[PDB]
Amino acid sequence: EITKKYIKDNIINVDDNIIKKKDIFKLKNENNEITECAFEYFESKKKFDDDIESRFFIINDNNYNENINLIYKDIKYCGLNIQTTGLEVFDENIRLIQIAVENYPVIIYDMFNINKKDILDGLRKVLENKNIIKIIQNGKFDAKFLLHNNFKIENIFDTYIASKLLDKNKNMYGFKLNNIVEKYLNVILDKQQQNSVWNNSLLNNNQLFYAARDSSCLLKLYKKLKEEIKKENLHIVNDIENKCILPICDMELNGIKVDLENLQKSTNEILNELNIEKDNLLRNYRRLYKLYSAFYLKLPLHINTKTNKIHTTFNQLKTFSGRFSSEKPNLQQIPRQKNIREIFIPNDNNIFIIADFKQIELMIAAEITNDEIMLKAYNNNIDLHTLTASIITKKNIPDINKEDRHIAKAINFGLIYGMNYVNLKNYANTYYGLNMSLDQCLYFYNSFFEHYKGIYKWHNQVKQKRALQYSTLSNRKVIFPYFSFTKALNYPVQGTCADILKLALVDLYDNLKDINGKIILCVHDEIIIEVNKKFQEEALKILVQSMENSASYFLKKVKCEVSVKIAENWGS
Ligand SMILES: [Cl-]
Ligand SMILES: [Cl-]
Ligand code: NA
């Protein structure tokens, strides 16, 4: 009886809190005349002990009144959330789409009980309207579901990204919605309802009050977190990261197509190999054993049988440095040999363009340290390993040879990141195959820091201060648990690289729309895009200019170097 009171709206009154009510709301038509309209909404009987908007409109095919769309007139921002039947976008559907507009009940789109397009026209206009801020928690997740269900969205403020940046990698956990709301608003949402079955055709009264509340809280969170972001001078990094959601979604949705012929043929090749090595019976066996078991055995599990592609998961802020991380599969863990890389290929009538930054870590070090010899050397287009070779050997560039440059690579990568001369001996002889003496390495140390005075000043200022707070050129921030000299030198370089790559993906995303380019992959200091073969030379220019513009945003005293190649596979 009471349970059956609002089946008309596909709701179940399990308890006795849900009450339907009708009242007039304050609204305005296009002619700047106050049309105050009547609407039917739902409110709890037991009042919540907080100011979070718990009331809501529910939209369905039955009780659709067009005038709720006019709530969106002249808004500047709105809370946005969805409720899904699961996590995997391809294998799941959006159950609810909630829109929280300030000082009104939460508008909830019942997607399982709407089969007409005209209702969603109001929603689609809001989401496309670049002049509305969409406050979201877990913006990549929601944006993926919307983009896959043909919705379009621009202009996002992700409370997860804001909460992570403000945390400065002091915590691994505590970035769920209930955690963030408990922290910044001191409110405990009903986190049981995250697990509750949204695949039901009807929904219970507690589910929808959770639905509404978990969107309306975003308005208060937006005020608190935007203020906190501005206090900590994190607006530049937070703004880049929010804009970077959409390129990330483009990568996770586009995926990368796989050549199953060379994959299976290659897998049979490794079979014949390791069986033949057992017949011949550490070097070749563990090579084949890991190459098979790590690569050729696990990669078949990730490809989608229908589409012949891998859709990896890109993490945005789950690293110390701030660089992207990838998992399921970890794209950086793919072997760098060409025989395997060539398996990954474009789609039909498309082609890869692949661009790498060159020496960007060293250039960033020159920038931030103001090292005169390095900066003027880069401006003259003199290679830094050639430069160090000249300083060490005291020879001129026409006399420097490949052996000198090799020792110089060990000296630069060794000493720039904080190694002493003993660690330089072990580092060079291990990773570069030299046999340097400790007297020679001591000469390299004194000569290197005698000439590179900015780098020397950088190292001694860090070692003297023993600080824990460190930052990048985007003002991304980290707080160390304890002082580590090498980590302290590594953070501004690597974190500025992450800033450059992420902003490059933002500009690249906005620029590739005309040719309908697809962003595929970002690993280390490399970016891969797909375009139809007619836009080949064009997309070459778009990619290089986007990456250069990002590096030009952050770096003033040094011009980056992009190496770009067009390819029909990753291994080229
Ligand atoms: Cl600051
Ligand atoms: Cl901001
Ligand atoms: Na969400």
3-state SS record for 258-292 = ECHHHHHHHHHHHHHHHHHHHHHCCHHHHHHHHHH
C-alpha to C-alpha distance for 544 and 566, rounded to whole angstroms? 12
In angstroms, what is the span from residue 533 Cα to ligand 1's centroid?
46
The one-letter code for the residue type at 71 is: I
Supply 126's token pair. Answer: 């809001």
Nearest partner of 94 among 36, 13, 153, judged by Cα: 153
In angstroms, what is the span from residue 394 Cα to ligand 1's centroid?
42
Q: CA dist 99 to 17, 82, 151, 217, 234, Å? A: 22, 9, 14, 11, 27
C-alpha to C-alpha distance for 125 and 148, rounded to whole angstroms? 17
Q: Could you say which DSSP state residue 47 is in? A: P
3-state secondary structure of 293: helix
Containing 428, the helix (H) or strand (E) segment is helix 421-431
Containing 141, the helix (H) or strand (E) segment is helix 139-148
Q: CA dist 375 to 170, 226, 412, 456, 492, Å? A: 34, 37, 15, 15, 17
The pairing of beta strand 56-59 with beta strand 106-110: parallel
C-alpha to C-alpha distance for 311 and 89, rounded to whole angstroms? 11
In angstroms, what is the span from residue 21 Cα to ligand 3's centroid?
28
Containing 256, the helix (H) or strand (E) segment is strand 256-258
DSSP 298-366: HGGGTS-TTT-EE--EEESS-SSS---EEESS-GGGS--SHHHHTTEE--TTEEEEEEEE-SHHHHHHH
Q: Count other Cβ atoms within 10 Å, centred on residue 70.
A: 17
Q: Could you tell me which residues come within 8 angstroms of residue 110 by beta carbon, excluding any fewer than 6 positions away?
A: 9, 10, 58, 59, 60, 96
Q: Are 487 and 493 spatial neighbours (Cβ–Cβ below 8 Å)?
A: no
In angstroms, what is the span from residue 231 Cα to ligand 2's centroid?
10
C-alpha to C-alpha distance for 472 and 455, rounded to whole angstroms? 17
Nearest partner of 135 among 119, 120, 153, 151, judged by Cα: 153
Residue 36 backbone phi and psi in degrees, to 5:
-95, 120
Ligand closest to Cα of 232 equals 1
Q: Are 571 and 338 spatial neighbours (Cβ–Cβ below 8 Å)?
A: yes
Q: Count other Cβ atoms within 10 Å, centred on residue 154.
A: 13
The pairing of beta strand 526-532 with beta strand 350-357: antiparallel
For the chain, how are helix, strand and coil distributed in percent, rounded to 5? 50, 15, 35
In angstroms, what is the span from residue 231 Cα to ligand 1's centroid?
9
User: What residue segments make up the domains of the chain, in order of their start?
Assistant: 11-232, 256-309, 311-360+468-572, 372-451
C-alpha to C-alpha distance for 496 and 483, rounded to whole angstroms? 20
Ligand closest to Cα of 162 equals 2
Nearest partner of 491 among 468, 513, 509, judged by Cα: 468
C-alpha to C-alpha distance for 524 and 438, rounded to whole angstroms? 33
Resolution limit, Å? 2.8
Q: Which residue has 């970890």 as its token pair?
A: 330
Supply 236's token pair. Answer: 């530049």
In angstroms, what is the span from residue 49 Cα to ligand 3's centroid?
23
3-state secondary structure of 86: coil
Ligand closest to Cα of 229 equals 2
Supply 479's token pair. Answer: 């707080």
C-alpha to C-alpha distance for 455 and 493, rounded to whole angstroms? 13
Q: Count other Cβ atoms within 10 Å, centred on residue 282.
A: 6
Q: Could you say which DSSP state residue 571 is in? A: T
In angstroms, what is the span from residue 229 Cα to ligand 2's centroid?
6
Ligand closest to Cα of 474 equals 1
In angstroms, what is the span from residue 81 Cα to ligand 3's centroid?
5
CA atoms within 13 A on the CB side of 551: 24
In angstroms, what is the span from residue 490 Cα to ligand 2's centroid?
26
In angstroms, what is the span from residue 395 Cα to ligand 3's centroid?
61
In angstroms, what is the span from residue 211 Cα to ligand 3's centroid?
10
Nearest partner of 351 among 93, 534, 97, 117, judged by Cα: 534
Q: Are 44 and 204 spatial neighbours (Cβ–Cβ below 8 Å)?
A: no
Length of the chain: 572
Work out the burial of residue 439: count CB atoms within 10 Å of its CB; fewer than 13 is exposed, 13-18 middle, 19 or more buried: exposed
B/e letters for 104-121, b = 16+ CB within 10 Å, e = fewer, are: bbbbbbbbbbbeeeebbe
Ligand closest to Cα of 239 equals 2
Q: Are 9 and 63 spatial neighbours (Cβ–Cβ below 8 Å)?
A: yes
Q: Are 454 and 370 spatial neighbours (Cβ–Cβ below 8 Å)?
A: yes
Q: Could you tell me which residues come within 8 angstroms of residue 384 by beta carbon, excluding any fewer than 6 positions away?
A: 359, 362, 374, 377, 378, 412
3-state secondary structure of 72: helix
C-alpha to C-alpha distance for 97 and 102, rounded to whole angstroms? 16
Q: Are 165 and 237 spatial neighbours (Cβ–Cβ below 8 Å)?
A: yes
Cα 281 to chain centroid distance, Å, stands at: 47
In angstroms, what is the span from residue 238 Cα to ligand 2's centroid?
6
In angstroms, what is the span from residue 162 Cα to ligand 2's centroid?
8
Structural biology method used: X-ray
C-alpha to C-alpha distance for 21 and 9, rounded to whole angstroms? 13
The one-letter code for the residue type at 387 is: L
Q: Are 563 and 376 spatial neighbours (Cβ–Cβ below 8 Å)?
A: no
Give the largest CA-CA distance in the chain: 96
Supply 233's token pair. Answer: 């001078």
C-alpha to C-alpha distance for 250 and 92, rounded to whole angstroms? 18
Supply 106's token pair. Answer: 């939460």
Peptide bond before residue 329 is cis, with ω within 30 degrees of 0: yes
Handedness of CA 232, 233, 235, 236 (dihedral sign): negative
Containing 470, the helix (H) or strand (E) segment is strand 469-471
The one-letter code for the residue type at 344 is: F
Q: Count other Cβ atoms within 10 Å, centred on residue 551.
A: 25
Outline where DSSP puts E strands in 67-132: 77-84, 94-100, 106-110
In angstroms, what is the span from residue 135 Cα to ligand 3's centroid?
9
* Residues, CB-to-ion distance under 5 Å, ligand 2: 229, 235, 238
Q: Could you give the angle at the alpha carbon of 569 between the alpha carbons of 563 and 572, nearest 5°?
A: 50
In angstroms, what is the span from residue 11 Cα to ligand 3's centroid?
22
C-alpha to C-alpha distance for 163 and 415, rounded to whole angstroms? 36
Work out the burial of residue 19: count CB atoms within 10 Å of its CB; fewer than 13 is exposed, 13-18 middle, 19 or more buried: middle
C-alpha to C-alpha distance for 137 and 454, rounded to whole angstroms? 42
In angstroms, what is the span from residue 137 Cα to ligand 3's centroid?
4
C-alpha to C-alpha distance for 359 and 175, rounded to whole angstroms? 35
Q: Are 374 and 368 spatial neighbours (Cβ–Cβ below 8 Å)?
A: no
The one-letter code for the residue type at 137 is: Q
C-alpha to C-alpha distance for 373 and 448, rounded to whole angstroms? 11
In angstroms, what is the span from residue 112 Cα to ligand 3's centroid?
18
Supply 63's token pair. Answer: 């009780």
Q: Could you tell me which residues come within 8 angstroms of residue 95 by beta carbon, excluding any fewer than 6 positions away?
A: 82, 83, 84, 85, 111, 112, 198, 199
Q: Could you say which DSSP state residue 32 is in? A: S
Nearest partner of 244 among 474, 518, 501, 495, judged by Cα: 501
Ligand closest to Cα of 143 equals 3
What is the topology classification, in CATH, of domain 311-360+468-572?
Answer: Alpha-Beta Plaits (3.30.70)
Nearest partner of 135 among 108, 161, 109, 111, judged by Cα: 161
In angstroms, what is the span from residue 160 Cα to ligand 3's centroid?
9
Q: End-to-end distance of the chain based on CA atoms, in angstroms? A: 70
Superfamily of domain 11-232: Ribonuclease H-like superfamily/Ribonuclease H (3.30.420.10)
Q: Are 244 and 502 spatial neighbours (Cβ–Cβ below 8 Å)?
A: yes
In angstroms, what is the span from residue 177 Cα to ligand 3's centroid?
8
Chain breaks in the chain (C to N over 2.5 A) after: 281
Q: Could you give the angle at the alpha carbon of 441 between the alpha carbons of 440 and 447, nearest 5°?
A: 90
The one-letter code for the residue type at 142 is: D
Ligand closest to Cα of 137 equals 3
